[PDB]
Amino acid sequence: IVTPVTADVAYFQKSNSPRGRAACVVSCENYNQEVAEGLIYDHSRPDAAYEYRSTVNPWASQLGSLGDIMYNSSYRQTAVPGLYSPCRAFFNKEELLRN
Amino acid sequence: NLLLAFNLQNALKVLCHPRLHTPAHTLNSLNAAPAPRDRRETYSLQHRRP
Amino acid sequence: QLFAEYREWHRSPMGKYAAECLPSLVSISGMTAMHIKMSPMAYIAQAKL
Amino acid sequence: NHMNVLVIVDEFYDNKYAAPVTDIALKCGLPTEDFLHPSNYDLLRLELHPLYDIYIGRDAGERARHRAVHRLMVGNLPTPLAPAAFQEARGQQFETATSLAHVVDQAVIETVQDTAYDTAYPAFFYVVEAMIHGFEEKFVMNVPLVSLCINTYWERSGRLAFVNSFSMIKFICRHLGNNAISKEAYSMYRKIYGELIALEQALMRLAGSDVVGDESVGQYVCALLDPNLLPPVAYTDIFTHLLTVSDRAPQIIIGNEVYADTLAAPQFIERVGNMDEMAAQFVALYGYRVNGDHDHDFRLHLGPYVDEGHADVLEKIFYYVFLPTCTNAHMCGLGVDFQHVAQTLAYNGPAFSHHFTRDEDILDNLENGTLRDLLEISDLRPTVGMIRDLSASFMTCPTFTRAVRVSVDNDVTQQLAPNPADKRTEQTVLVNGLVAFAFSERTRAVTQCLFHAIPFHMFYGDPRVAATMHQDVATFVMRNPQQRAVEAFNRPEQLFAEYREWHRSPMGKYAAECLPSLVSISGMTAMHIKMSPMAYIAQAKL
Amino acid sequence: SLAHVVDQAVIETVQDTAYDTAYPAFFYVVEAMIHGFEEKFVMNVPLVSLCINTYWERSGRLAFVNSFSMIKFICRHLGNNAISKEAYSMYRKIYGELIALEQALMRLAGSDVVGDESVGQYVCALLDPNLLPPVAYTDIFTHLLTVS
Amino acid sequence: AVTQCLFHAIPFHMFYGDPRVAATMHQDVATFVMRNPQQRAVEAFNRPE
Amino acid sequence: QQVNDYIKAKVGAQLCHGQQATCEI
Amino acid sequence: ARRLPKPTLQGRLEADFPDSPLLPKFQELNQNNLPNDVFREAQRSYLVFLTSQFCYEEYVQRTFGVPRRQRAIDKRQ
Amino acid sequence: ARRLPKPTLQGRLEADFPDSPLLPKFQELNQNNLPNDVFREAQRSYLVFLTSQFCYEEYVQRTFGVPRRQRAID
């Protein structure tokens, strides 16, 4: 997952999500999609942990972002080439919104 | 167990606010004081026009 | 007729820093840290830098 | 529609009320902690791709779709996501990897920086440099004159002349090894010229011994060995050579008369040179020069492309990492009226009559003209013969200066855009112009009738230089003071496009804010490296 | 990232010019005669060049540093070998240091506009054009009156 | 330019086959390294066999 | 008004976790 | 749509140096069509062209073999 | 209200340098109503004014035509 060089080491020592905003979609309200998409993708509000910033990196947590393109735009069907992608667990918007 | 940073930009929601930049409540708190200061200098308070 | 200190820009502590400091580069760079307003816009500009 | 650059820069800057800053400049201004704050979401939402710089224009009824142009180098990364200290550390890692030999020291960098902020730089050096405009034969018409110039400016200051342009550097380091200057000036000149060879060695060892096809990976790894990047000032017909040696497709915008082929060359470029077809062409070229159709005449005239041994990579390294770092991007290209600088010197008393002998001083004979005060503020004492042979080059210098907009597609690995208009990377190149350092009002009052300012490139569009050079931009930056950062100056759209340029605002910022040293030059060289696949290959090598 | 183009010993020389009891008042006389006019400066070029030369030979100090406008005028006109070279380089150190401070103050709060006017006149005092120089020789007042 | 009539370049040995100086002496190898910028290295420069 | 909403834009003027502690200056 | 202004370049120095042989080739100039000042600018430009032409001829007379052997055998004997 | 003291500036050099052509312009101010000392200081002020005028026109007649083409050709 490509990130900029100013991503701090203090993030990468704690058991975080690999993208910027920790998508705690359990912490949003039940059966609601707009506030969960606001928590995940809307970067005008700060995230759940580090309220002094929006995201630890902008190239993974944004909606049109680079890692979002290379991992989320693929959808894990059955009859694909089917190499196991670990970042599909943390980038699939259907799987994020399932919580 | 995170390591958060309270920089100066997080304090701007409280600091740079017009309640923190008016002297009117201080002057109301000072003019209502029963015992004001007794020195009361008058050297350079105002400029008199020549 | 010339200098009313409570109406003037540069009060006593700035002149004290002027007479008190030693003439060097760090004194000049410290002097331009003293020509910063305590305005909300300057608080924004100082939280930026 | 009309290729007169003076009315372009005059009517772009005349009483412009609002000075719109762009997204790239607002991106590179603030530092890394204010960037990821939610208060700058309007800039954060337009950064999704590290290589592509996404923007959005005005809604003309078609939803105003987002267009993504490519950041061709590493140097155009957003500076809150790539700070200048990171680029210095990356340049030091590259310097350790390729093991380049620094043949310039701190002191020559401090000397060219002392020339750079010299408001007392005499404009007569720019006068003779305009009279040469990149010709070897013109440089050897006037060897004792330029030698007198270099010696007088080296004794009167700690400063060296003619370091504002590459052609002077190469011509002195080649020609003037005959002790007609001081030894220290020649040593400094060849230190510059050998530093350029050392940087060419560093780039050739950055990616060598790999051939992707017919050609090597040298054009696929960096901006400096890539022939699609051009020098900012052009004195020869490098556009015709560009149209040949480019495997990809270049198109040369010359006043709405674009041509991409060498078959249309003789109706666009008038090949001049070597003093001898001009020896019959004199009266005809002068008669063409006295007709005022040149603002709507769409033809260029240049010297022939000399076959340099390095394929104009020295000029590229010079104007792209050397001068914007030691000068801290404090240059501006000037447009010069070649008839006027000839009308100063030739239409003059002792320079006209041949009663006045060759080897005698002129200053007690100079009448009250502009060139009189020019030589007085230049404190320079020429003889009659050197200024006569100086004036002897009027019959080959161009009518004015011009400006072309060289467009070229990005790469074969940077061509993946869906929109075919954004597969192109344009670049303005100042044909037959001149790049200057800085002026005072004493100089500018003399060369008001001679030179005119051009906010030309990201490195050569400094408002500090134009402000002491031009009047409309001076009252413009008085009415809007925040333009004085070189990344935030609003340049004319006919001569600059900040979303189409090679070097965007981050390289201008890194040029301005770096401190002049060898480490800064090694860092700036590590900005002129592509974000290409072959560049990732050659970077994983070293 | 200010680049201190001026040197430590330049500060020492101008401080030693401030402390000199034998700083001549004839420099104050010719300053009072010119009072910041460029036409009066080009009238009296050889006189002030003689001043700079004699004050650079009889001491290490530099003259006319009591006023901004003489620094501006020496940086403008007197760079044509009529004064000593190193004193002119120190004058250009002063003039370039003022340029470097102006550059640094603009890089403090720039590319951020509140309206017609930038934020620069509100974040410091010295980019506010309402604050005025202590000494004045030209009509800055009607200029202030227009731009305020 | 003055010594087209007196000298000629011989890239014969490993330490004495640098194309950086050969291109300043022989016009043809200058066009050769202009066609091939990767050949400016002394270690891979195609010497006469 | 322009300086007033400029400041209100440069600051967070007009939550998902834990009912965060209200800091004070 | 415009140019730079003209420098001072005062007077008509062709009447101030009437000895120069540039005045025969300059002397065929005409003012049937142009106004007075633009004709003066045309005269200035033609004096510049003629002076640069004469100076280039003096230049190429010097560069094209200044050292001779006939002057050598004169200065020998 | 209050002025500066005068400098010394001793002597009446107008009566010691009688051949200056400024004195036919200097001699016009007279002593009808005013006493001696104020007439002396007015004569000093008019003399420095007239001398400044003469060296000013001398400066401009220097800087207007200090080169000439006529001496250059002949």
mmCIF file of N, CA and C in Angstrom, chain D residues 99-159:
data_model
loop_
_atom_site.group_PDB
_atom_site.id
_atom_site.type_symbol
_atom_site.label_atom_id
_atom_site.label_comp_id
_atom_site.label_asym_id
_atom_site.label_seq_id
_atom_site.Cartn_x
_atom_site.Cartn_y
_atom_site.Cartn_z
ATOM 1 N N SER D 99 28.172 7.888 -6.560
ATOM 2 C CA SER D 99 29.520 8.302 -6.160
ATOM 3 C C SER D 99 30.068 9.396 -7.075
ATOM 4 N N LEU D 100 29.296 10.468 -7.201
ATOM 5 C CA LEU D 100 29.686 11.573 -8.060
ATOM 6 C C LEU D 100 30.779 12.379 -7.377
ATOM 7 N N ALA D 101 31.655 12.968 -8.180
ATOM 8 C CA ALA D 101 32.746 13.788 -7.676
ATOM 9 C C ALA D 101 32.301 15.242 -7.702
ATOM 10 N N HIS D 102 32.213 15.858 -6.530
ATOM 11 C CA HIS D 102 31.870 17.270 -6.445
ATOM 12 C C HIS D 102 33.109 18.093 -6.757
ATOM 13 N N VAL D 103 33.157 18.663 -7.960
ATOM 14 C CA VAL D 103 34.299 19.488 -8.330
ATOM 15 C C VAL D 103 34.021 20.967 -8.116
ATOM 16 N N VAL D 104 32.814 21.326 -7.716
ATOM 17 C CA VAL D 104 32.559 22.675 -7.236
ATOM 18 C C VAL D 104 32.562 22.653 -5.712
ATOM 19 N N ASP D 105 33.002 23.749 -5.114
ATOM 20 C CA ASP D 105 33.102 23.864 -3.671
ATOM 21 C C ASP D 105 31.966 24.729 -3.138
ATOM 22 N N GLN D 106 32.045 25.085 -1.860
ATOM 23 C CA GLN D 106 31.115 26.065 -1.322
ATOM 24 C C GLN D 106 31.360 27.450 -1.899
ATOM 25 N N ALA D 107 32.626 27.803 -2.137
ATOM 26 C CA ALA D 107 32.985 29.191 -2.412
ATOM 27 C C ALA D 107 32.542 29.648 -3.794
ATOM 28 N N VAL D 108 32.578 28.768 -4.792
ATOM 29 C CA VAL D 108 32.105 29.162 -6.115
ATOM 30 C C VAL D 108 30.584 29.263 -6.115
ATOM 31 N N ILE D 109 29.919 28.410 -5.331
ATOM 32 C CA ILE D 109 28.479 28.530 -5.135
ATOM 33 C C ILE D 109 28.141 29.831 -4.423
ATOM 34 N N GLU D 110 28.953 30.226 -3.439
ATOM 35 C CA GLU D 110 28.734 31.506 -2.777
ATOM 36 C C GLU D 110 29.028 32.671 -3.714
ATOM 37 N N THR D 111 29.975 32.500 -4.637
ATOM 38 C CA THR D 111 30.286 33.547 -5.606
ATOM 39 C C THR D 111 29.169 33.742 -6.621
ATOM 40 N N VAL D 112 28.617 32.651 -7.148
ATOM 41 C CA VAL D 112 27.515 32.803 -8.088
ATOM 42 C C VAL D 112 26.249 33.251 -7.354
ATOM 43 N N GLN D 113 26.114 32.921 -6.063
ATOM 44 C CA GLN D 113 25.021 33.482 -5.278
ATOM 45 C C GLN D 113 25.222 34.969 -5.027
ATOM 46 N N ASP D 114 26.474 35.408 -4.918
ATOM 47 C CA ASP D 114 26.759 36.830 -4.777
ATOM 48 C C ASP D 114 26.482 37.578 -6.071
ATOM 49 N N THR D 115 26.663 36.916 -7.212
ATOM 50 C CA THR D 115 26.245 37.534 -8.466
ATOM 51 C C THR D 115 24.732 37.562 -8.560
ATOM 52 N N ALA D 116 24.084 36.561 -7.963
ATOM 53 C CA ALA D 116 22.649 36.366 -8.118
ATOM 54 C C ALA D 116 21.844 37.469 -7.455
ATOM 55 N N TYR D 117 22.206 37.850 -6.234
ATOM 56 C CA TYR D 117 21.518 38.917 -5.525
ATOM 57 C C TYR D 117 22.198 40.259 -5.722
ATOM 58 N N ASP D 118 22.983 40.400 -6.779
ATOM 59 C CA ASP D 118 23.682 41.642 -7.065
ATOM 60 C C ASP D 118 22.730 42.562 -7.809
ATOM 61 N N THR D 119 22.214 43.561 -7.101
ATOM 62 C CA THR D 119 21.446 44.622 -7.728
ATOM 63 C C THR D 119 22.325 45.601 -8.493
ATOM 64 N N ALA D 120 23.643 45.535 -8.309
ATOM 65 C CA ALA D 120 24.591 46.334 -9.066
ATOM 66 C C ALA D 120 25.191 45.572 -10.235
ATOM 67 N N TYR D 121 24.502 44.556 -10.735
ATOM 68 C CA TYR D 121 24.989 43.844 -11.906
ATOM 69 C C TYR D 121 24.814 44.718 -13.142
ATOM 70 N N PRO D 122 25.890 45.023 -13.867
ATOM 71 C CA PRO D 122 25.789 45.954 -14.998
ATOM 72 C C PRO D 122 25.029 45.336 -16.158
ATOM 73 N N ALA D 123 24.161 46.137 -16.770
ATOM 74 C CA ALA D 123 23.355 45.648 -17.877
ATOM 75 C C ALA D 123 24.136 45.548 -19.176
ATOM 76 N N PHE D 124 25.351 46.099 -19.232
ATOM 77 C CA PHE D 124 26.171 45.984 -20.431
ATOM 78 C C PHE D 124 26.611 44.557 -20.697
ATOM 79 N N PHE D 125 26.716 43.739 -19.650
ATOM 80 C CA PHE D 125 26.940 42.313 -19.841
ATOM 81 C C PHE D 125 25.759 41.678 -20.556
ATOM 82 N N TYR D 126 24.542 42.087 -20.196
ATOM 83 C CA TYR D 126 23.372 41.624 -20.924
ATOM 84 C C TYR D 126 23.335 42.189 -22.335
ATOM 85 N N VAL D 127 23.916 43.372 -22.546
ATOM 86 C CA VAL D 127 23.959 43.964 -23.882
ATOM 87 C C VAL D 127 24.854 43.142 -24.800
ATOM 88 N N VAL D 128 26.064 42.816 -24.336
ATOM 89 C CA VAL D 128 26.952 42.025 -25.185
ATOM 90 C C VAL D 128 26.444 40.594 -25.310
ATOM 91 N N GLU D 129 25.789 40.060 -24.270
ATOM 92 C CA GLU D 129 25.211 38.723 -24.365
ATOM 93 C C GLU D 129 24.039 38.683 -25.339
ATOM 94 N N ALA D 130 23.278 39.773 -25.433
ATOM 95 C CA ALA D 130 22.279 39.894 -26.481
ATOM 96 C C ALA D 130 22.921 40.008 -27.852
ATOM 97 N N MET D 131 24.085 40.650 -27.938
ATOM 98 C CA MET D 131 24.741 40.761 -29.235
ATOM 99 C C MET D 131 25.342 39.429 -29.677
ATOM 100 N N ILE D 132 25.676 38.550 -28.731
ATOM 101 C CA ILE D 132 26.169 37.226 -29.104
ATOM 102 C C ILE D 132 25.011 36.293 -29.412
ATOM 103 N N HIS D 133 24.080 36.180 -28.458
ATOM 104 C CA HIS D 133 22.929 35.258 -28.434
ATOM 105 C C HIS D 133 23.264 33.857 -28.948
ATOM 106 N N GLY D 134 24.332 33.293 -28.395
ATOM 107 C CA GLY D 134 24.647 31.892 -28.611
ATOM 108 C C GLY D 134 25.318 31.557 -29.925
ATOM 109 N N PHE D 135 26.267 32.371 -30.359
ATOM 110 C CA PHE D 135 27.013 32.107 -31.578
ATOM 111 C C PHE D 135 28.500 32.100 -31.275
ATOM 112 N N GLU D 136 29.167 31.029 -31.700
ATOM 113 C CA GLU D 136 30.607 30.905 -31.526
ATOM 114 C C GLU D 136 31.350 31.971 -32.313
ATOM 115 N N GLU D 137 30.922 32.193 -33.558
ATOM 116 C CA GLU D 137 31.538 33.212 -34.396
ATOM 117 C C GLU D 137 31.328 34.607 -33.818
ATOM 118 N N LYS D 138 30.175 34.849 -33.184
ATOM 119 C CA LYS D 138 29.943 36.154 -32.592
ATOM 120 C C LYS D 138 30.758 36.321 -31.328
ATOM 121 N N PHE D 139 30.981 35.225 -30.604
ATOM 122 C CA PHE D 139 31.852 35.265 -29.440
ATOM 123 C C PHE D 139 33.292 35.553 -29.842
ATOM 124 N N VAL D 140 33.711 35.088 -31.023
ATOM 125 C CA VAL D 140 35.076 35.399 -31.442
ATOM 126 C C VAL D 140 35.190 36.627 -32.332
ATOM 127 N N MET D 141 34.099 37.356 -32.606
ATOM 128 C CA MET D 141 34.302 38.719 -33.101
ATOM 129 C C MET D 141 34.931 39.588 -32.023
ATOM 130 N N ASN D 142 34.526 39.379 -30.773
ATOM 131 C CA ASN D 142 34.683 40.354 -29.701
ATOM 132 C C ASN D 142 35.349 39.752 -28.470
ATOM 133 N N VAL D 143 36.460 39.046 -28.676
ATOM 134 C CA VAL D 143 37.215 38.494 -27.548
ATOM 135 C C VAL D 143 37.801 39.556 -26.616
ATOM 136 N N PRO D 144 38.482 40.625 -27.093
ATOM 137 C CA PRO D 144 39.038 41.579 -26.118
ATOM 138 C C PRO D 144 37.987 42.367 -25.364
ATOM 139 N N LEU D 145 36.811 42.580 -25.957
ATOM 140 C CA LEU D 145 35.742 43.284 -25.257
ATOM 141 C C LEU D 145 35.215 42.468 -24.087
ATOM 142 N N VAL D 146 34.859 41.204 -24.333
ATOM 143 C CA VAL D 146 34.338 40.364 -23.260
ATOM 144 C C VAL D 146 35.436 40.047 -22.248
ATOM 145 N N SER D 147 36.700 40.031 -22.682
ATOM 146 C CA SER D 147 37.801 39.829 -21.747
ATOM 147 C C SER D 147 37.969 41.031 -20.823
ATOM 148 N N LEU D 148 37.841 42.243 -21.377
ATOM 149 C CA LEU D 148 37.846 43.457 -20.569
ATOM 150 C C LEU D 148 36.685 43.468 -19.585
ATOM 151 N N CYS D 149 35.516 42.996 -20.031
ATOM 152 C CA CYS D 149 34.342 42.910 -19.164
ATOM 153 C C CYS D 149 34.578 41.977 -17.982
ATOM 154 N N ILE D 150 35.105 40.779 -18.255
ATOM 155 C CA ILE D 150 35.322 39.792 -17.198
ATOM 156 C C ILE D 150 36.381 40.273 -16.220
ATOM 157 N N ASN D 151 37.465 40.876 -16.730
ATOM 158 C CA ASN D 151 38.518 41.365 -15.840
ATOM 159 C C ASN D 151 38.042 42.516 -14.968
ATOM 160 N N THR D 152 37.319 43.480 -15.550
ATOM 161 C CA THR D 152 36.850 44.621 -14.771
ATOM 162 C C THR D 152 35.828 44.202 -13.724
ATOM 163 N N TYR D 153 34.916 43.295 -14.080
ATOM 164 C CA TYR D 153 33.948 42.832 -13.096
ATOM 165 C C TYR D 153 34.562 41.893 -12.068
ATOM 166 N N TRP D 154 35.701 41.281 -12.370
ATOM 167 C CA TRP D 154 36.346 40.445 -11.374
ATOM 168 C C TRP D 154 37.260 41.235 -10.452
ATOM 169 N N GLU D 155 37.774 42.379 -10.895
ATOM 170 C CA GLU D 155 38.527 43.205 -9.959
ATOM 171 C C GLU D 155 37.623 44.108 -9.135
ATOM 172 N N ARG D 156 36.512 44.580 -9.705
ATOM 173 C CA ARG D 156 35.686 45.549 -8.999
ATOM 174 C C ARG D 156 34.787 44.899 -7.964
ATOM 175 N N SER D 157 34.694 43.576 -7.965
ATOM 176 C CA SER D 157 33.835 42.886 -7.026
ATOM 177 C C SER D 157 34.379 41.483 -6.840
ATOM 178 N N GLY D 158 33.747 40.735 -5.941
ATOM 179 C CA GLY D 158 34.042 39.326 -5.790
ATOM 180 C C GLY D 158 33.176 38.477 -6.696
ATOM 181 N N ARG D 159 32.613 39.107 -7.717
ATOM 182 C CA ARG D 159 31.546 38.549 -8.522
ATOM 183 C C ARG D 159 32.048 38.312 -9.945
#
